[PDB]
């Protein structure tokens, strides 16, 4: 097969700016890559084809550069529209596998989360699963850490993450972590705390929950 | 390579299902199915392993796995009736082509061909030439081996009444001019003596 | 214009053959070549299968990953494209489209891309069965924190509302999360004034569809 | 629709040459190569030459390589396949096919056959034997048909039935007319059975008595 790499994942820029997006291939495709721009839960759109010619449909700001292993999108001037995924595709021999994945973030100065510490669910104690919600509000940059923490040791394998997207106002993100103890789990530990290292965070700021 | 190996004929009832197989050696690829009606170009039914194109209707379905490919013909209608060849790509990307199959589908009653034998004729005599005549008519299916007991036998041809006929024609010298034709339709032998 | 549809797409136990089918309107069937693509939810897409048109064969060809599992076939007559699978995973859960390979020309063996797609279908792969959502409060301990966790969500999307409705600026709605048993995980971030959070009447309404079952909870302090 | 037309093949000597033309209307000729299948009579379908869609290469069945050249005349939208030293046996109808064996086109009939007109010998065969007869006459060495043969000049129309000409090894057709007549009217109606050979523009004409 022909392996796909995308380069980086995550790519920040402001409304306006230049964006290169970097897709790199193992053996020469002889300019025949496909790039394909997600919107968030919607159907995949053809951007870019035969590398640099353009697809009709799409205005002049998207362009497309390189050929035999580096291919590269030049957008001009970066509009609300098109801040989506990315995607580049191969189409030399089979099999079209696709890329990893662009995402566009909206850049935004630096904003460190709020740290909320949701304590045990009463009603769930003698439902049989206890579980533990720690709530970080208005968070930038989408990368974060969250360490769960019970009786000063770090527990790992029973934590679920989830992220939501950026807010179409603020441009903010929110991230929840769930701890999975049982009821014998949930008895035997004595301090719960959830760990946050943020970039805007100066130091790592625990908060702790007394059963 | 040799050609894919497929059954000679195939008797199906009216509105009851046709099985056709086309185990061959090594086709290693998607064998496509096709249709000849007789006096008529080619047309393809299935393609791929059970693909349809347009203008076919849902009576033909296909399978294919390991070595064998099988045609699916659910309630096949009497019109339907015609040659069905197998075909395959072979890795060489040569293509191979099946002997062929005929539907036989009984439409009309089933019946024992009637054979009339023909003995040398007198100009034939004088002129030092023998043709043993062998006519086989009223044949049904039209499927008849033509067998010389002591040889060039048309092709089974539809007669004017539906019924499938044939003729057989066997040369031999003055010198050597009892004979007998051997005739088997459908399991059964007809014998005549001349 | 041109149109996709799809259907075939529901909960399958694992190891079980469903069937997907992708209507074709707007545009000649027979001479274009129809391919499959995955999208795992939170992951990235993946390509499953292709078939050529009718004028190269229709040599059908899948990714590693797929192979020996799905079959594809297409049908011309009533341009419809079938995809089907056997020995189903829970790794397959994902949401499946249907994508028209257009030729380089107007018709040649070389593909330059997929030009239409179609809206999707979501294919889950799941044991468990349909459950009702539960609702655990998580009390407020300047803006503070007060929401409710959905628990044990089976085969469903989920609606969450805040104040009956009331409260539509500062509702933080996460994505769901696959439980290890199988059910789904969700949480609600409503963010109020402290003083405010004593006076207002924070109800949350939980609709599950599926299961036919309407959940209210009420969030305060403990 | 993809609709294609040869032509260009007829009846030629052993050893002769022929070239048969493709004509291809609704699909670009340079997209999709083409191939040669060839029906020989009483018998299935056989490959014979195919060419890649940029002409690339040339694939040839082993029965007919170092004989058969095939060439896509891609700027008049053609396809030609050119034939040298025929054999005996080669005689069929060739089939024009689109790669993978789409679309195929009517055929054309290719004869090689040594034969030339000659005129038919119309053998008596009375029926020897016996309430109803069959009795005609055979028409051997007919070179191309096809033959009219006729019962009391056309005057009998009911009960006789004509065999299909058989493609002797002689390379000459053989033909077989007999009319199924009541055994009492044997010896009253009148016999006569007329042969008018089209190829040979020979009408021969023979009496049948008991």
């Known amino acids: 097969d022909i392996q796909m790499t995308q380069s980086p994942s995550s790519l920040s820029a402001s409304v306006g700016d230049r964006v290169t997006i970097t897709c790199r291939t193992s053996q020469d495709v002889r300019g025949a890559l496909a790039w394909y721009q997600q919107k968030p839960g919607k159907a995949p759109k053809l951007l870019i084809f035969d590398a640099s010619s353009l697809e009709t449909g799409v205005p002049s700001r998207f362009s497309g550069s390189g050929s035999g292993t580096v291919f590269t999108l030049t957008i001009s001037s970066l509009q609300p529209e098109d801040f989506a995924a990315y995607y580049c595709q191969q189409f030399l021999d089979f099999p079209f596998t696709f890329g990893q994945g662009t995402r566009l973030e909206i850049k935004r100065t630096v904003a460190a989360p709020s740290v909320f510490i949701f304590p045990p669910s009463d009603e769930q104690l003698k439902s049989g699963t206890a579980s533990v919600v720690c709530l970080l509000n208005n968070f930038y940059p989408r990368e974060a850490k969250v360490q769960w923490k019970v009786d000063n040791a770090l527990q790992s394998g029973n934590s679920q993450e989830s992220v939501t997207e950026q807010d179409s106002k603020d441009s903010t993100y929110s991230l929840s972590s769930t701890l999975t103890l049982s009821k014998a789990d949930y008895e035997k530990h004595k301090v719960y705390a959830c760990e946050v290292t943020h970039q805007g965070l100066s130091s790592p700021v625990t908060k702790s929950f007394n059963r | 390579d040799i050609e894919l190996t497929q059954p000679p004929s195939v008797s199906v009832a009216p509105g009851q299902t046709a099985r056709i197989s086309c185990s061959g050696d090594?086709?290693?690829?998607?064998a496509y199915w096709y249709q000849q009606k007789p006096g008529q170009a080619p047309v393809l039914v299935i393609y791929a392993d059970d693909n349809r194109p347009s203008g076919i209707p849902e009576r033909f379905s296909g399978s294919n796995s390991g070595n064998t490919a099988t045609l699916t013909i659910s309630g096949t209608q009497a019109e339907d009736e015609a040659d069905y060849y197998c075909?395959?790509?072979?890795?060489?990307?040569?293509?191979?082509f099946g002997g062929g199959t005929k539907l036989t589908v009984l439409g009309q009653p089933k019946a024992a061909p009637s054979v009339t034998l023909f003995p040398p004729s007198s100009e034939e005599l004088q002129a030092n030439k023998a043709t043993l005549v062998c006519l086989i008519s009223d044949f049904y299916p039209g499927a008849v081996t033509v067998a010389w007991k002591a040889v060039e036998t048309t092709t089974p041809s539809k007669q004017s009444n539906n019924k499938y006929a044939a003729s057989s024609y066997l040369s031999l010298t003055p010198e050597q001019w009892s004979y007998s034709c051997q005739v088997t339709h459908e399991g059964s032998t007809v014998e005549k003596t001349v | 214009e041109v149109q996709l549809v799809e259907s075939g797409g529901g909960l399958v136990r694992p190891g079980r053959s469903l069937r997907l089918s992708c209507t074709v309107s707007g545009f000649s069937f027979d001479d274009s070549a129809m391919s499959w693509v995955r999208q795992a939810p939170g992951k990235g897409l993946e390509w499953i299968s292709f078939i050529k048109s009718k004028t190269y064969g229709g040599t059908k060809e899948y990714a590693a990953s797929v192979k020996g599992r799905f079959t594809i076939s297409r049908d011309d007559s009533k341009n419809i494209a079938y995809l089907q699978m056997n020995s189903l995973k829970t790794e397959d859960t994902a949401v499946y489209y249907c994508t028209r390979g257009a030729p380089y020309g107007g018709n040649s063996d070389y593909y330059y891309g997929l030009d239409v797609w179609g809206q999707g279908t979501t294919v889950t792969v799941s044991s468990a069965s349909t459950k009702g959502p539960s609702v655990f409060p998580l009390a407020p301990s300047g803006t503070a924190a007060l929401g409710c966790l959905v628990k044990d969500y089976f085969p469903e999307p989920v609606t969450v509302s805040w104040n009956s409705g009331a409260l539509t600026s500062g509702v933080h709605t996460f994505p769901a999360v696959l439980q290890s048993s199988g059910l789904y995980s969700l949480s609600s971030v409503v963010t109020v004034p402290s003083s405010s959070l004593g006076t207002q009447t924070y109800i949350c309404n939980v609709n599950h569809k599926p299961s036919n079952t309407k959940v209210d909870k009420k969030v305060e302090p403990k | 629709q993809v609709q294609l037309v040869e032509s260009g093949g007829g009846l030629v000597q052993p050893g002769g040459s022929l070239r048969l033309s493709c004509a291809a209307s609704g699909f670009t000729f340079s997209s999709s190569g083409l191939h040669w299948v060839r029906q020989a009579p009483g018998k299935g379908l056989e490959w014979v030459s195919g060419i890649d869609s940029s002409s690339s290469t040339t694939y040839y069945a082993d029965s007919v390589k170092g004989r058969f050249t095939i060439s896509r005349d891609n700027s008049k939208n053609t396809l030609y396949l050119q034939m040298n030293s025929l054999r005996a046996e080669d005689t069929a109808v060739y089939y024009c096919a689109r790669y993978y064996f789409d679309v195929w086109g009517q055929g054309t009939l290719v004869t090689v056959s040594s034969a030339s007109t000659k005129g038919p010998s119309v053998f008596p065969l009375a029926p020897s034997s016996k309430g109803t007869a069959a009795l005609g006459c055979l028409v051997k060495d007919y070179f191309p048909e096809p033959v009219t043969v006729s019962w009391n000049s056309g005057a009998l129309t009911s009960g006789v039935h004509t065999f299909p000409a058989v493609l002797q090894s002689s390379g000459l057709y053989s033909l077989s007319s007999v009319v199924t007549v009541p055994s009492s009217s044997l010896g009253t109606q009148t016999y006569i059975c007329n042969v008018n050979h089209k190829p040979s523009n020979t009408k021969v004409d023979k009496k049948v008595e008991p």
């Open positions: 075909s395959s790509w072979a890795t060489d990307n040569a293509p191979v």
């Open positions: 090594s086709i290693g690829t998607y």
